[PDB]
Amino acid sequence: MASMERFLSVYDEVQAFLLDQLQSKYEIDPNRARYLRIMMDTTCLGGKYFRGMTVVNVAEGFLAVTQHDEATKERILHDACVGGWMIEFLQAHYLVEDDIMDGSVMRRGKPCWYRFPGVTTQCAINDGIILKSWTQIMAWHYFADRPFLKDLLCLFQKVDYATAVGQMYDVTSMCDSNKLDPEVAQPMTTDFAEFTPAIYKRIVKYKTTFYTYLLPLVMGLLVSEAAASVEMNLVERVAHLIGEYFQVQDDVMDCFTPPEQLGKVGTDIEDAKCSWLAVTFLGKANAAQVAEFKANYGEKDPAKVAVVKRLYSKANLQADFAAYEAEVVREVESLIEQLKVKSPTFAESVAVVWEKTHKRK
């Protein structure tokens, strides 16, 4: 059976399970079940399932080299699909809550869930809560007797917490750290002293890399009982390296990808985000370019936004980007080779994870 159709079919199974349980144990009525079903589909479906399918792909790799009965192959593939959905639903939690926190308008070319007329923020906050709760319900039901339960839940819990800490890092990235104070309304930085490569790296590491790269790779190892085929420090290194690059691509697309292709009107500049473009620009600008950036960044005015985009284009950030890509392509290749000492298989899955990232469009 092709991997994606297995994955998709497990979505239907897991949804049915979730909703039936709500009826049989949580007293739900049919109308609220339908609401939840619609919420699930709208928030979990329609992406490319990069994350959840990496779990399947890692598991498929091990299956090709490991002796098992047919029933055990099917069990492993089903557990990888369930695991993959846990990650998709965790992403869906974060996208719903982030869209509300950021006042986002669209995502993937449709309104953000909270903007739907019969949702509202009041419901959407809780719907996003539910989405993460469902990841646990899936795990306890499908993995109850599994040896990897404990490790998987502990891993998931750390990845979730890493992500939440990343979200803080991101939303506070245009404030001066020394002025953070619940009691005082926060001003935008005026010096941009914290727009550095190291501070950027921290935001991105936590905000995305753990759930987008570390968790899919490690969950595939866990459902395969293969965590001893890897050096885990290497897996975390490669995950953070690739996930950084992922984010750099997202930052460049926010500023330069047409909204129709983006699924989104990009507002990083108006929002004063600590983006790769801003940090790279500040790393090479002269005094007068810096001052022009400071007078124009983090403002809603479209003319000031256009001034910042013009400054980036004049600064030929394309060449800094090509140079960053080359260094990544090189470091990722190094790490793949180190991964081959213990598992050619696993290294190949990481290679596929890299090709897909590098060519994403």
- CA angle 55/57/58 to nearest 5° reads 65
19 near ligand LV4, judged by CB under 6 A? no
Site string for a copy of itself, 61-80 (x = CB under 8 A): --------------------
The reply to whether 320 sits in an annotated binding site is no
The reply to whether 170 sits in an annotated binding site is yes
Distance CA 344, CA 120 (A): 49
- Token pair, residue 202, equals 């921290």
Site for ligand LV4 in 246-305 (CB under 6 A): 246, 252, 256
CA–centroid distance for 223 within its chain: 21
Distance CA 293, CA 289 (A): 6
184 near a copy of itself, judged by CB under 8 A? yes
Smallest distance from the beta carbon of 208 to a copy of itself, in angstroms? 15
161 near a copy of itself, judged by CB under 8 A? yes
155 near ligand LV4, judged by CB under 6 A? yes
Site for a copy of itself in 301-340 (CB under 8 A): none
Work out which of 88, 97, 127, 254 binds Zn ion, going by CB under 5 A.
Answer: 254
177 near ligand LV4, judged by CB under 6 A? no
Smallest distance from the beta carbon of 285 to ligand LV4, in angstroms? 13
Applying CB under 8 A, which part among 28-36, 46-54, 71-79, 281-289 lies near a copy of itself?
28-36
Smallest distance from the beta carbon of 206 to a copy of itself, in angstroms? 7
The reply to whether 102 sits in an annotated binding site is yes
The reply to whether 12 sits in an annotated binding site is no
Work out which of 98, 151, 231, 270 binds Zn ion, going by CB under 5 A.
Answer: 98
Applying CB under 8 A, which part among 21-29, 219-227, 315-323, 351-359 lies near a copy of itself?
21-29
Work out which of 102, 231, 236, 292 binds Zn ion, going by CB under 5 A.
Answer: 102
Q: Are strands 110-111 and 106-107 parallel, antiparallel or unpaired?
A: antiparallel
The reply to whether 236 sits in an annotated binding site is yes
Instruction: From the list a copy of itself, ligand LV4, Zn ion, none, pick the one residue 214 interacts with, judged by a Cβ distance below 5 to 8 Å according to partner type.
Output: ligand LV4
SS3 string, the chain, reads: CCHHHHHHHHHHHHHHHHHHHHHHHCCCCHHHHHHHHHHHHHHHCCCCCHHHHHHHHHHHHHHCCCCCCHHHHHHHHHHHHHHHHHHHHHHHHHHHHHHHHHCCCEECCEECHHHCCCCHHHHHHHHHHHHHHHHHHHHHHHHCCCCCHHHHHHHHHHHHHHHHHHHHHHHCCCECHHHCCCCCCCCECCCCCCCCHHHHHHHHHHHHHHHHHHHHHHHHHHHCCCHHHCCHHHHHHHHHHHHHHHHHHHHHHHHHCCHHHHCCCCCCCCCCCCCHHHHHHHCCCCHHHHHHHHHHCCCCCHHHHHHHHHHHHHCCHHHHHHHHHHHHHHHHHHHHHHHCCCCHHHHHHHHHHHHHHHCCC
Site for a copy of itself in 112-131 (CB under 8 A): 116-119, 121-123, 125-127, 129-130
- Token pair, residue 170, equals 């991101």
Distance CA 297, CA 273 (A): 9
141 near ligand LV4, judged by CB under 6 A? no
317 near ligand LV4, judged by CB under 6 A? yes
Torsion angles phi and psi, residue 108, rounded to 5: 50, 35
232 near ligand LV4, judged by CB under 6 A? yes
Site string for ligand LV4, 318-337 (x = CB under 6 A): x--x----------------
Site for ligand LV4 in 44-83 (CB under 6 A): 47-48, 50
Residues binding a copy of itself (CB under 8 A): 22, 26-29, 31-32, 34-35, 38-39, 42, 97, 100-103, 116-119, 121-123, 125-127, 129-130, 133-134, 136-137, 140, 150, 153-154, 157, 160-162, 164-165, 167-169, 171-172, 177-178, 180-186, 202, 205-206
Q: Binding site membership for Mn(2+): which residues?
A: 98, 102, 170, 250, 254
